[PDB]
Amino acid sequence: FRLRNIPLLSRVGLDRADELRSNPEELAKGWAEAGLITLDVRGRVNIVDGQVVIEDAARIGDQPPEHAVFLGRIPGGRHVWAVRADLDEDSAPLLDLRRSGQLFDDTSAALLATAMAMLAWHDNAGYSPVDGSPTIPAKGGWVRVNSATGQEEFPRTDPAIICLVHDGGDRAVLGRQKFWPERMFSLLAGFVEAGESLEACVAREVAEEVGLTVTDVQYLGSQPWPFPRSIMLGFHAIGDPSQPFAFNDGEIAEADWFTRAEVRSALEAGSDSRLMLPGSISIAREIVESWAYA
Amino acid sequence: TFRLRNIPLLSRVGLDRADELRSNPEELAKGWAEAGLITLDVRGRVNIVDGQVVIEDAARIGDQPPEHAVFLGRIPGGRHVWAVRADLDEDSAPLLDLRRSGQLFDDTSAALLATAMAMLAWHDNAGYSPVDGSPTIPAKGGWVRVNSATGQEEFPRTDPAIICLVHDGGDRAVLGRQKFWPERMFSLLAGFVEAGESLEACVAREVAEEVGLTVTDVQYLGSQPWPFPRSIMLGFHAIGDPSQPFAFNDGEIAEADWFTRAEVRSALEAGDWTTDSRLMLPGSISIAREIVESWAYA
Ligand SMILES: Nc1ncnc2c1ncn2[C@@H]1O[C@H](COP(=O)(O)O)[C@@H](O)[C@H]1O
Ligand SMILES: Nc1ncnc2c1ncn2[C@@H]1O[C@H](COP(=O)(O)O)[C@@H](O)[C@H]1O
Ligand SMILES: [Ca+2]
Ligand SMILES: [Ca+2]
Ligand SMILES: [Ca+2]
Ligand SMILES: [Ca+2]
Ligand SMILES: [Ca+2]
Ligand SMILES: [Ca+2]
Ligand SMILES: [Ca+2]
Ligand SMILES: [Ca+2]
Ligand SMILES: [Ca+2]
Ligand SMILES: [Ca+2]
Ligand SMILES: [Ca+2]
Ligand SMILES: [Ca+2]
Ligand SMILES: [Ca+2]
């Protein structure tokens, strides 16, 4: 099977205008009538008519500040930037783009995903991992330069796999983590280690978490996941129900095989039956859904 | 259209990484008695014997496993195996680096070395928290570094990069030459994944930047660890349109054209970047060569 829909946040991006990042002058010239998006500490943002709030940008400075991040151009040719800031409690702020991002258009969601991962990175990359030195933003916020050595540090996106193990027919593995509300299962996920391919990572993470041996590992799609800095790569793989479970790396409290039937009805639910699926914008939902209605 | 014919080098086997033991100091110490040791110089080079990475008896550097070492897992039989950085004599024995000699290694050895190489390099570049600045200390068989002030864990970094074959849906495909390569040397289009984009959007973005084409039907082919120093390469193909002219916007690309399967097959047979004619293909151990090859022979 294949994914039915492109997952939220993946539907192409903007004109990120790589060119201009290394061109301080052009940034300054376009800043006059630039746009500004603003994110609080928790990554919350404002929305209006299904669209991200874009202030007039000049109303915080003459020039673009160092702590800002240049996001690109929007249809028409107008620059757009992002800053970390407090937000006004007297607006409509979204606590989690993760749980509410379906309210936004594709463009706005792209802006926000970019802005959110970058700002979070800045907040976690003020020092070189190499020596310890302070670091300084540059190039529209797309690098941080070591203050001692001049060496560039770049935005960090950790790849993670998320997998649906199925039997090749009508059944599929879902699992629940230690502290999750009961009756709540989802796909198996794990970070890619150094020295392994995605395919090997899937097989490894599945074996660790539920003790199955899988084959026929196939990619379904991908999704930026700024919480704070993942990119999720979706897979499916064939397991064997006869092989018993085993919770070695005990991140998984409970797991079972579920029927297509069970999953379809669990998808419709969202306090009745034994399986319930958490309701987010995740590619996880799109994978489960694309399998269950093959 | 197509799938990869071969599993790309460095992906051909997974180790028994023995996740269990990393958080179990005792079991590490018990198996260290008859453990194996791989040793890498600063440049990631190692010694090999009969196409296999050299695994010393491990006790000959310690009573116990040192802090700077990295636990790689088990080998068939159940024997532990570790890796350390050390200076090695350039002159007493040949030192091989995976980048140019990975084809000479067996699959297991190549996996071990790729893991060991990316991890040790990471340690050398993660002695301080990026967050605050504090020293950091290896732990859990070297798979984390703990901040000394806060106790917060830092983890190994792998940067994803895409590499793409743009084809017309039939018999032609885009290849390009970077300004900083020799003059008859072409390959696929590549790029790092930026924050806030999916792989598919990255492919479309990087293709548009480098050669100014608009692509659709972006499909994954496979992946390959790329510890030079810390990438993972994700291979794709996409459909372009030959009638749309080229344009070298983000001028990393000096020249590019559409090539026939015929042309590419004969270019593959001539040689790669290391080895007459106007097209010659970089890629030996790269998934790039495997993608081009898998497309050109159907
Ligand atoms: N995580 C990253 N590591 C290295 N280079 C990166 C990364 N993310 C983006 N880049 C860009 O990749 C280019 C470096 O090319 P290269 O010399 O092949 O590493 C520059 O334009 C960087 O801004
Ligand atoms: N590369 C990584 N980046 C961030 N956290 C990681 C990484 N590798 C392992 N972890 C930690 O390991 C936990 C679960 O491991 P996993 O089974 O790989 O999902 C995560 O919640 C993280 O705290
Ligand atoms: Ca551009
Ligand atoms: Ca107010
Ligand atoms: Ca997990
Ligand atoms: Ca995860
Ligand atoms: Ca793991
Ligand atoms: Ca295990
Ligand atoms: Ca795990
Ligand atoms: Ca059952
Ligand atoms: Ca010499
Ligand atoms: Ca590039
Ligand atoms: Ca690259
Ligand atoms: Ca890039
Ligand atoms: Ca680029």
XYZ file of C-alpha atoms and ligand atoms in Angstrom:
651
model
C 0.000 0.000 0.000
C 0.844 3.695 -0.287
C -0.157 6.788 1.697
C -3.553 8.179 0.630
C -2.724 11.751 1.639
C 0.436 13.790 1.902
C 0.900 14.176 5.699
C 0.299 17.605 7.226
C 3.380 19.868 7.086
C 4.841 18.024 4.065
C 2.912 19.651 1.191
C 5.965 21.379 -0.385
C 7.291 24.580 1.244
C 7.902 28.204 0.285
C 10.478 30.192 -1.607
C 12.995 29.842 1.228
C 15.340 32.116 -0.792
C 18.621 30.398 0.110
C 20.337 33.068 -2.041
C 19.610 35.952 0.327
C 20.815 34.360 3.570
C 24.417 35.245 2.648
C 23.577 38.776 1.495
C 23.073 41.066 4.545
C 22.260 44.070 2.336
C 19.324 42.542 0.452
C 17.864 41.375 3.774
C 18.058 44.953 5.107
C 16.472 46.481 1.988
C 13.447 44.141 2.067
C 12.995 44.469 5.854
C 11.176 47.800 5.430
C 7.944 46.080 4.324
C 8.789 42.589 5.598
C 6.491 40.227 7.498
C 7.060 38.908 11.007
C 5.784 35.726 12.648
C 6.106 35.381 16.428
C 6.393 32.222 18.560
C 6.374 31.943 22.353
C 8.683 29.694 24.409
C 6.382 26.670 24.031
C 6.157 27.108 20.243
C 2.606 28.515 20.405
C 1.403 30.919 17.695
C -1.589 33.040 16.686
C -3.965 32.346 13.811
C -6.517 34.471 11.919
C -8.905 33.122 9.239
C -6.976 29.823 8.987
C -3.685 31.672 8.439
C -0.611 32.535 10.483
C -0.425 36.051 11.912
C 2.082 38.130 9.930
C 2.835 41.497 11.557
C 4.460 44.426 9.810
C 8.101 43.733 10.613
C 9.653 47.211 10.893
C 7.771 47.692 14.167
C 10.554 46.114 16.241
C 13.626 47.769 14.706
C 15.309 49.653 11.889
C 17.197 46.491 10.909
C 16.733 42.669 11.196
C 17.912 41.501 14.671
C 20.419 38.686 15.163
C 17.964 36.451 17.099
C 15.501 36.453 14.171
C 15.340 33.817 11.421
C 14.698 34.531 7.727
C 12.002 32.217 6.362
C 11.877 33.365 2.735
C 9.376 35.128 0.455
C 5.601 34.768 0.086
C 3.540 35.070 -3.173
C 4.114 38.678 -4.276
C 7.797 38.768 -3.287
C 7.501 39.990 0.316
C 10.127 38.831 2.845
C 8.981 37.073 6.050
C 10.928 36.508 9.289
C 10.372 34.818 12.663
C 11.290 35.763 16.227
C 10.923 34.259 19.662
C 8.795 36.523 21.884
C 6.163 36.560 24.615
C 2.629 36.384 23.217
C -0.451 38.411 24.147
C -2.775 36.320 26.306
C -5.634 38.411 24.843
C -5.511 36.568 21.512
C -6.338 33.094 20.133
C -3.048 31.172 20.822
C -2.612 27.474 19.990
C -0.939 25.503 22.803
C 0.315 22.813 20.390
C 0.651 22.989 16.586
C 0.916 19.204 17.061
C -2.770 18.975 18.055
C -4.268 21.934 16.164
C -2.191 22.442 13.001
C -5.066 21.145 10.835
C -6.622 24.638 11.259
C -3.865 26.185 9.116
C -3.401 26.308 5.354
C -0.402 24.467 3.905
C 1.720 27.639 3.494
C 1.152 28.816 7.073
C 1.941 25.331 8.388
C 5.227 25.283 6.449
C 6.231 28.699 7.790
C 5.431 27.593 11.318
C 7.239 24.260 11.098
C 10.374 25.961 9.781
C 10.181 28.842 12.251
C 9.525 26.526 15.163
C 12.414 24.099 14.539
C 14.919 26.900 13.886
C 14.050 28.987 16.958
C 14.172 25.876 19.115
C 17.598 25.071 17.643
C 18.952 28.576 18.368
C 17.776 28.209 21.966
C 19.744 24.933 22.182
C 22.919 25.841 20.258
C 24.478 28.858 21.967
C 27.713 26.926 22.570
C 29.989 24.830 20.344
C 29.773 21.099 21.222
C 33.376 20.875 20.060
C 35.232 23.228 22.430
C 32.560 24.981 24.557
C 32.794 28.488 23.066
C 29.788 30.862 22.779
C 28.258 30.897 19.268
C 26.687 33.777 17.314
C 23.772 33.661 14.809
C 24.476 34.658 11.198
C 23.213 34.396 7.616
C 19.561 35.176 8.364
C 19.830 32.915 11.432
C 20.685 29.810 9.364
C 24.088 29.289 11.025
C 25.738 29.971 14.352
C 29.433 30.900 14.172
C 31.798 29.821 16.927
C 33.180 32.989 18.553
C 36.701 31.635 19.134
C 37.291 29.533 15.960
C 34.801 30.949 13.399
C 33.558 27.405 12.691
C 29.916 27.164 11.587
C 27.284 25.147 13.444
C 24.190 24.148 11.440
C 20.508 23.382 12.285
C 20.110 19.880 13.699
C 17.279 17.623 12.543
C 17.313 14.133 14.072
C 15.851 11.432 11.771
C 13.431 9.025 13.432
C 11.582 6.058 11.969
C 7.946 5.219 12.675
C 6.711 1.837 11.594
C 3.556 -0.215 11.086
C 4.318 -3.917 11.534
C 1.641 -5.970 9.726
C 1.239 -9.700 8.987
C 0.852 -9.216 5.209
C -2.939 -9.574 5.479
C -5.411 -8.233 8.023
C -3.477 -7.687 11.268
C -1.036 -5.070 12.548
C 1.079 -4.350 15.629
C 0.450 -1.320 17.808
C 2.122 -0.636 21.165
C 1.747 1.588 24.240
C 4.485 3.304 26.226
C 4.940 2.913 29.988
C 3.055 5.966 31.254
C 0.382 6.299 28.537
C -3.351 6.307 29.476
C -4.618 2.747 29.128
C -6.280 1.594 25.896
C -4.015 4.033 23.993
C -1.716 2.424 21.400
C 0.233 3.741 18.400
C 3.010 2.903 15.935
C 6.550 2.008 16.996
C 9.109 4.799 16.752
C 12.846 5.228 17.247
C 15.806 7.435 16.383
C 18.291 6.442 13.677
C 21.693 5.602 15.123
C 25.036 6.348 13.478
C 26.226 3.656 11.077
C 22.842 2.161 10.127
C 20.453 2.484 7.201
C 16.798 3.357 7.779
C 15.840 -0.228 6.923
C 18.186 -1.660 9.542
C 17.012 0.953 12.054
C 13.373 -0.117 11.559
C 14.302 -3.786 12.070
C 16.437 -2.901 15.082
C 13.882 -0.602 16.740
C 11.077 -3.110 16.205
C 13.198 -5.941 17.687
C 14.211 -3.852 20.702
C 10.748 -2.537 21.557
C 8.507 -5.609 20.929
C 10.964 -8.426 20.067
C 9.680 -9.171 16.541
C 11.818 -9.994 13.513
C 10.563 -8.078 10.475
C 11.255 -8.106 6.726
C 10.084 -6.230 3.615
C 10.648 -2.790 5.152
C 9.176 -0.129 2.824
C 9.081 3.668 3.059
C 5.682 5.391 2.995
C 6.600 9.056 3.401
C 8.095 11.696 5.693
C 7.081 14.588 7.946
C 8.990 17.483 9.615
C 8.485 17.116 13.373
C 9.714 20.202 15.295
C 9.064 18.886 18.792
C 11.716 19.982 19.140
C 13.800 18.778 16.180
C 12.819 15.481 14.536
C 11.992 14.437 11.017
C 9.758 11.373 10.960
C 10.231 8.768 8.240
C 7.260 6.416 7.886
C 7.663 2.716 7.079
C 5.761 -0.564 7.036
C 7.180 -4.038 7.552
C 6.027 -7.653 7.613
C 6.171 -9.552 10.919
C 4.933 -12.973 12.065
C 2.108 -13.272 14.667
C 3.344 -16.736 15.780
C 6.566 -15.204 17.120
C 5.671 -14.096 20.704
C 6.188 -10.546 21.954
C 9.084 -9.511 24.220
C 9.645 -6.099 25.836
C 13.461 -5.941 26.042
C 14.062 -2.186 25.808
C 11.122 -1.694 28.141
C 9.709 1.520 26.692
C 6.655 -0.558 25.674
C 4.262 -1.573 28.471
C 1.773 -3.431 26.259
C 1.269 -4.434 22.602
C -0.937 -6.695 20.472
C -1.982 -7.484 16.906
C -5.140 -5.671 15.792
C -7.456 -6.433 12.879
C -8.192 -3.992 10.067
C -11.746 -4.027 11.459
C -10.550 -3.068 14.961
C -8.355 -0.264 13.616
C -11.036 1.233 11.335
C -13.424 1.503 14.295
C -10.626 2.845 16.521
C -9.908 5.523 13.887
C -13.594 6.556 13.934
C -13.676 6.766 17.761
C -10.815 9.251 18.320
C -14.487 5.675 25.495
C -15.949 2.293 24.525
C -13.508 -0.319 23.113
C -10.009 -1.600 23.944
C -8.136 0.369 21.262
C -8.114 4.173 21.077
C -5.863 6.293 18.853
C -4.384 9.654 20.029
C -5.520 12.553 17.846
C -2.683 14.609 16.355
C -1.403 15.764 12.961
C 1.135 12.909 13.009
C 2.080 10.866 9.957
C 1.341 7.969 12.351
C -2.414 8.445 11.852
C -2.022 8.752 8.072
C -0.042 5.482 7.932
C -2.521 3.525 10.055
C -5.421 4.972 8.070
C -3.799 4.236 4.695
C -3.280 0.594 5.722
C -6.714 -0.025 7.261
C -8.586 1.249 4.161
C -6.147 -0.257 1.623
C 9.764 2.845 -12.712
C 12.519 1.027 -10.842
C 14.069 -0.234 -7.607
C 17.663 -0.643 -6.437
C 19.312 -3.825 -7.771
C 21.763 -4.081 -4.864
C 21.682 -3.053 -1.238
C 24.112 -0.077 -1.098
C 27.480 -0.694 0.544
C 27.510 -0.054 4.315
C 23.831 -1.089 4.563
C 24.389 -4.770 3.652
C 24.138 -6.009 7.225
C 23.071 -4.736 10.638
C 25.199 -5.513 13.698
C 23.882 -7.112 16.846
C 24.257 -3.727 18.552
C 23.174 -5.319 21.865
C 21.187 -2.280 23.044
C 20.386 -4.135 26.310
C 23.954 -4.063 27.630
C 24.719 -0.366 27.097
C 22.884 0.494 30.355
C 24.396 -2.383 32.330
C 27.999 -1.587 33.440
C 28.416 -5.023 35.038
C 27.614 -7.137 31.972
C 29.983 -4.964 29.906
C 32.777 -5.637 32.415
C 32.098 -9.401 32.549
C 32.343 -9.816 28.756
C 35.380 -7.511 28.452
C 37.704 -10.355 29.504
C 37.494 -11.961 26.045
C 36.202 -8.916 24.157
C 37.351 -7.652 20.772
C 38.818 -4.246 20.008
C 38.919 -2.214 16.807
C 41.247 0.790 16.671
C 40.885 3.876 14.489
C 43.320 6.712 13.942
C 42.141 10.328 13.880
C 41.281 10.187 10.163
C 39.087 7.097 10.675
C 41.657 4.769 9.073
C 42.164 1.189 10.290
C 44.230 -1.916 9.591
C 42.717 -4.822 7.688
C 43.660 -8.453 7.209
C 42.132 -10.710 4.536
C 39.422 -8.118 3.800
C 38.410 -7.921 7.461
C 38.880 -5.238 10.099
C 41.482 -6.165 12.709
C 39.959 -7.206 16.022
C 42.577 -7.290 18.785
C 42.187 -9.112 22.074
C 40.697 -6.310 24.148
C 42.235 -6.948 27.598
C 45.538 -5.587 26.276
C 44.542 -1.982 26.965
C 42.820 -2.308 30.347
C 41.527 -4.416 33.208
C 38.153 -2.775 32.518
C 36.512 -0.939 29.543
C 37.840 2.657 29.315
C 35.568 5.687 29.230
C 36.655 6.887 25.751
C 35.727 3.537 24.177
C 32.462 2.776 22.393
C 30.596 -0.525 22.618
C 29.637 -1.747 19.139
C 27.793 -4.939 20.092
C 28.358 -8.665 19.549
C 29.752 -10.703 16.657
C 28.542 -14.227 15.639
C 29.392 -16.416 18.634
C 28.378 -13.827 21.242
C 31.751 -12.083 21.664
C 31.630 -8.385 22.617
C 33.488 -5.871 20.427
C 34.523 -2.285 21.181
C 36.196 0.594 19.372
C 38.739 3.152 20.536
C 40.545 6.079 19.028
C 44.341 5.614 19.020
C 47.377 6.789 17.068
C 48.534 4.020 14.702
C 51.814 3.733 12.760
C 51.337 4.925 9.167
C 54.521 3.027 8.254
C 54.304 -0.361 10.016
C 51.110 -1.427 8.230
C 48.642 -0.096 5.585
C 45.856 2.090 6.954
C 42.569 1.916 5.047
C 39.778 4.483 5.176
C 36.234 3.311 4.444
C 35.621 6.149 1.960
C 38.068 4.880 -0.673
C 38.442 1.217 0.300
C 35.036 0.140 1.657
C 34.578 -2.355 -1.192
C 37.605 -4.324 0.091
C 35.866 -4.989 3.430
C 33.338 -7.714 4.233
C 29.843 -6.529 5.105
C 30.146 -6.991 8.877
C 33.547 -5.251 9.058
C 32.203 -2.335 6.999
C 29.258 -1.953 9.381
C 31.497 -2.063 12.464
C 33.829 0.503 10.956
C 31.062 2.871 9.840
C 29.479 2.756 13.311
C 32.828 3.119 15.071
C 33.895 5.922 12.757
C 30.784 8.091 13.202
C 30.627 7.565 16.993
C 34.296 8.310 17.750
C 34.082 11.366 15.512
C 30.976 12.466 17.426
C 32.710 12.069 20.815
C 35.559 14.244 19.504
C 32.932 16.899 18.592
C 30.607 16.715 21.631
C 32.727 17.276 24.736
C 30.568 20.282 25.668
C 26.805 20.822 25.897
C 25.484 22.999 23.019
C 22.868 24.204 25.484
C 24.901 25.780 28.302
C 28.597 25.040 27.565
C 29.316 22.524 30.345
C 31.832 19.650 29.915
C 30.126 16.346 29.008
C 31.095 12.794 30.028
C 30.618 9.553 28.020
C 28.324 6.893 29.460
C 26.327 3.793 28.576
C 29.025 2.133 26.468
C 29.777 5.529 24.902
C 26.263 5.928 23.447
C 25.511 9.117 25.401
C 27.410 12.019 26.835
C 26.022 13.310 30.126
C 26.237 17.014 30.896
C 28.393 17.335 34.029
C 26.477 20.271 35.553
C 22.834 19.316 34.756
C 22.944 15.529 34.071
C 21.099 16.075 30.767
C 21.926 13.523 28.046
C 23.414 14.424 24.665
C 23.006 11.969 21.768
C 24.900 11.058 18.539
C 24.048 13.265 15.557
C 23.314 11.998 12.038
C 22.442 14.680 9.450
C 20.047 13.474 6.698
C 20.925 14.328 3.101
C 19.026 13.510 -0.091
C 20.440 12.414 -3.436
C 18.189 12.317 -6.468
C 18.055 11.014 -10.043
C 15.822 13.224 -12.175
C 14.575 11.238 -15.182
C 12.022 11.993 -17.922
C 9.897 8.900 -17.220
C 11.566 7.044 -20.102
C 15.119 6.934 -21.408
C 16.808 10.151 -20.253
C 18.156 11.401 -16.942
C 19.776 14.504 -15.473
C 23.365 14.402 -14.267
C 25.392 17.422 -13.208
C 28.936 18.588 -12.479
C 29.812 20.739 -9.467
C 32.156 23.679 -10.140
C 34.684 22.262 -7.648
C 35.045 18.816 -9.291
C 37.238 17.851 -12.306
C 35.811 18.419 -15.753
C 34.373 15.105 -16.988
C 32.966 14.042 -13.617
C 29.171 14.152 -13.181
C 26.743 12.727 -10.630
C 23.300 13.013 -9.076
C 21.927 16.092 -7.314
C 22.385 16.176 -3.548
C 21.520 18.365 -0.581
C 21.044 18.412 3.178
C 17.507 18.296 4.586
C 16.600 21.595 6.214
C 14.491 21.962 9.347
C 10.761 22.225 8.627
C 10.675 20.303 5.327
C 9.920 16.701 4.370
C 12.333 14.624 2.288
C 10.083 15.000 -0.750
C 10.010 18.789 -0.442
C 13.775 18.814 0.098
C 14.308 16.841 -3.122
C 12.066 19.243 -5.081
C 13.795 22.216 -3.430
C 17.361 20.983 -3.990
C 16.641 20.027 -7.597
C 15.080 23.446 -8.296
C 17.997 25.270 -6.634
C 20.783 23.361 -8.383
C 19.402 22.992 -11.961
C 16.097 24.945 -11.967
C 13.783 22.038 -12.857
C 10.343 21.367 -11.399
C 9.981 17.702 -10.462
C 7.132 15.415 -9.418
C 6.656 11.757 -8.425
C 9.504 11.847 -5.884
C 10.127 8.250 -4.710
C 12.570 6.736 -2.218
C 14.985 4.051 -3.437
C 17.052 3.334 -0.319
C 19.480 4.675 2.269
C 23.144 4.499 3.226
C 25.110 5.583 6.347
C 27.658 8.187 5.270
C 30.095 8.824 8.182
C 32.119 11.528 6.483
C 31.732 12.764 9.063
C 28.091 12.200 10.049
C 25.553 11.969 7.225
C 22.954 9.458 6.169
C 22.206 9.525 2.445
C 18.618 8.977 1.330
C 18.239 8.067 -2.327
C 15.340 9.210 -4.502
C 14.183 9.472 -8.102
C 11.854 12.077 -9.603
C 10.238 12.916 -12.931
C 11.256 16.121 -14.709
C 10.506 17.565 -18.156
C 13.350 17.968 -20.721
C 11.543 20.849 -22.480
C 11.842 23.052 -19.373
C 15.307 24.701 -19.789
C 18.052 24.448 -17.172
C 19.070 27.300 -14.850
C 21.984 27.310 -12.385
C 20.560 29.558 -9.657
C 22.328 28.352 -6.518
C 25.485 28.049 -8.591
C 26.919 24.840 -7.171
C 26.409 23.265 -10.625
C 28.762 24.251 -13.475
C 27.116 22.071 -16.133
C 24.302 19.549 -16.581
C 22.452 17.732 -19.361
C 20.014 14.911 -20.043
C 21.731 11.595 -20.830
C 20.466 8.350 -22.384
C 20.546 4.997 -20.606
C 22.928 3.962 -23.394
C 25.314 6.848 -22.623
C 25.236 6.144 -18.894
C 25.742 2.368 -19.231
C 28.883 2.943 -21.311
C 30.061 5.634 -18.872
C 29.545 3.171 -15.986
C 31.619 0.548 -17.835
C 34.476 3.030 -18.493
C 34.952 3.754 -14.778
C 34.057 5.937 -11.794
C 35.725 9.057 -10.326
C 38.985 7.152 -9.605
C 39.567 5.792 -13.163
C 39.042 8.423 -22.014
C 35.565 9.939 -22.660
C 33.561 13.043 -21.685
C 31.349 11.388 -19.039
C 32.828 9.409 -16.124
C 30.921 8.647 -12.931
C 31.918 9.418 -9.299
C 30.384 6.788 -7.085
C 31.972 3.543 -6.083
C 30.679 2.941 -2.575
C 28.151 5.782 -2.973
C 24.461 4.967 -3.245
C 24.655 7.473 -6.124
C 26.351 4.902 -8.385
C 23.875 2.211 -7.340
C 20.919 4.466 -8.239
C 22.318 5.448 -11.632
C 23.216 1.832 -12.358
C 19.806 0.517 -11.257
C 18.069 2.969 -13.611
C 20.337 2.566 -16.668
C 20.023 -1.245 -16.748
C 16.350 -2.270 -16.919
N 23.784 19.798 9.026
C 24.549 20.319 8.070
N 25.861 19.970 8.010
C 26.618 20.501 7.041
N 26.271 21.361 6.083
C 24.965 21.693 6.161
C 24.064 21.223 7.100
N 22.807 21.772 6.887
C 22.963 22.544 5.840
N 24.247 22.549 5.347
C 24.710 23.301 4.177
O 25.470 22.452 3.346
C 26.543 23.192 2.704
C 27.863 22.547 3.047
O 28.260 21.660 1.975
P 29.349 20.513 2.297
O 30.696 21.188 2.149
O 29.122 19.423 1.265
O 29.083 20.046 3.724
C 26.383 24.642 3.174
O 25.668 25.409 2.214
C 25.620 24.482 4.493
O 24.867 25.627 4.828
N 19.180 10.953 18.609
C 18.402 11.162 19.668
N 17.879 12.398 19.870
C 17.093 12.594 20.943
N 16.729 11.728 21.889
C 17.259 10.508 21.663
C 18.083 10.156 20.606
N 18.432 8.811 20.686
C 17.833 8.384 21.771
N 17.095 9.357 22.407
C 16.343 9.190 23.651
O 15.835 7.872 23.702
C 14.416 7.892 24.003
C 13.741 6.688 23.386
O 14.650 6.035 22.452
P 14.094 5.450 21.045
O 13.702 4.009 21.318
O 15.263 5.563 20.073
O 12.909 6.320 20.652
C 13.957 9.264 23.494
O 12.777 9.721 24.141
C 15.165 10.153 23.814
O 15.148 10.694 25.117
Ca 15.903 29.588 -4.986
Ca -3.763 43.127 25.946
Ca 10.416 4.967 21.096
Ca 10.674 9.307 18.532
Ca 17.671 3.596 20.275
Ca 17.936 -6.249 22.271
Ca 14.084 1.770 21.815
Ca -4.871 -10.999 20.061
Ca 54.331 6.848 4.936
Ca 23.414 21.305 -2.529
Ca 25.620 16.439 0.974
Ca 20.745 23.096 2.065
Ca 21.665 24.502 -1.493
